[PDB]
Paper text:
Protein tyrosine phosphatase 1B ([name]) is a negative regulator of leptin signaling in the hypothalamus, where it dephosphorylates the active site of leptin receptor–associated Janus kinase 2 and decreases signal transducer and activator of transcription 3 (STAT3) phosphorylation and transcription of the anorectic neuropeptide, pro-opiomelanocortin (POMC). As such, there has been substantial interest in the development of [name] inhibitors for the treatment of obesity. Focusing on the variants in and near the ordered catalytic domain, we ascribed structural mechanisms to their functional effects using in vitro enzyme activity assays, room-temperature X-ray crystallography, and local hydrogen–deuterium exchange mass spectrometry. By combining these complementary structural biology experiments for multiple variants, we characterize an inherent allosteric network in [name] that differs from previously reported allosteric inhibitor–driven mechanisms mediated by catalytic loop motions.
Some of these variants are located near known allosteric sites: for example, [name] and Q78R are adjacent to the conformationally bistable loop 16, which is known to be allosterically linked to the bistable, dynamic, catalytically essential WPD loop in the active site. Compared with WT, [name] and Q78R significantly decreased catalysis in vitro, consistent with them having the most extensive LOF effects in cells. Somewhat surprisingly, I19V also decreased catalysis in vitro, despite having no statistically significant effects in cells. These mutations decrease kcat but do not change Km, consistent with allosteric effects from their locations distal from the active site. FoldX mutational scanning applied to multiple crystal structures predicted destabilization for [name] (median ΔΔG ≈ +3.2 kcal/mol), whereas Q78R, P302Q, and I19V had only moderate effects (ΔΔG between −0.4 and +1.5 kcal/mol). The mutations were evident in 2Fo–Fc and Fo–Fc electron density maps for [name] and I19V. For [name], the difference features exclude the I19 area but otherwise span a similar region of [name], including the [name] mutation site and parts of the β sheet and active site. In addition, [name] increases exchange markedly for the mutation locus itself, consistent with FoldX computational predictions and room-temperature crystallography. It also decreases exchange dramatically for the active-site pTyr recognition loop, consistent with [name] exhibiting the most extensive functional impacts in vitro and in cells.
Residue numbers in the entry: 2 to 285
The structure:
Amino acid sequence: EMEKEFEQIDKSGSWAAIYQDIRHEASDFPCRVAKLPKNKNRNRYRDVSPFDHSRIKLHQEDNDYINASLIKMEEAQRSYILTQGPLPNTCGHFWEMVWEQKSRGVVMLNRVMEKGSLKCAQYWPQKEEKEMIFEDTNLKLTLISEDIKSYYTVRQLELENLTTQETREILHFHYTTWPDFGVPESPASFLNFLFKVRESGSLSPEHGPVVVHCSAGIGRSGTFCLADTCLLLMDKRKDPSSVGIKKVLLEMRKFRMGLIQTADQLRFSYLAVIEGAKFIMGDS
Ligand SMILES: [Mg+2]
């Protein structure tokens, strides 16, 4: 039982210690493509890079590089693409990746400005009548509708491949209330958001992998994928208490470095899974 695990760590105040064991135990694989000089301006942070073996490749000949990783959770039948918040010069690459990977949903866990600094380019349109065109990748993006709620916003976007004149509907799920510092006090609104993403079909295997990002694509983004996969495994397994958060987290870190950036995010991830378990053990 992980509810017990939680009390013992919390009573002992040993979150920082747990977190360090994860750090020391985590995989390290080469990131040679990310560190090429021609890609320096495609990385928002010098210390956050995709591993070569799991990086997403753009279907480009000049430069196929984008700071994005495929997380493949085989037992759960879930795949995610985790990426950084786009830079002013990588918005076209971002939407190219969504197109090429056949994704249905984009999950955004940050605000464009936090702590007085820009964390992400404004990569979607803010008004229906002012569409965006990405000339480098030949894509057009139109805002179709926007549903603003207290904790999150959902947008319907139309992505058009100008080369083929094909169009696809993309759902943008934007969690807007993650605090500038720390983690939410309660996981309730985070879990409600996660279940809205689930209910949309965006995580389902008929579609390409959902795209998840925050600023670096490892902290908040990691919390989202970890909670979703843990809750799914507790639905699937004969023994739900066989699901270990630390084991799942180390498996995901084989695919992208640094997932879960602070001991507070680790604690929050436990809280979200524990609370979410109450709903998937059957509270209709
Ligand atoms: Mg208007």
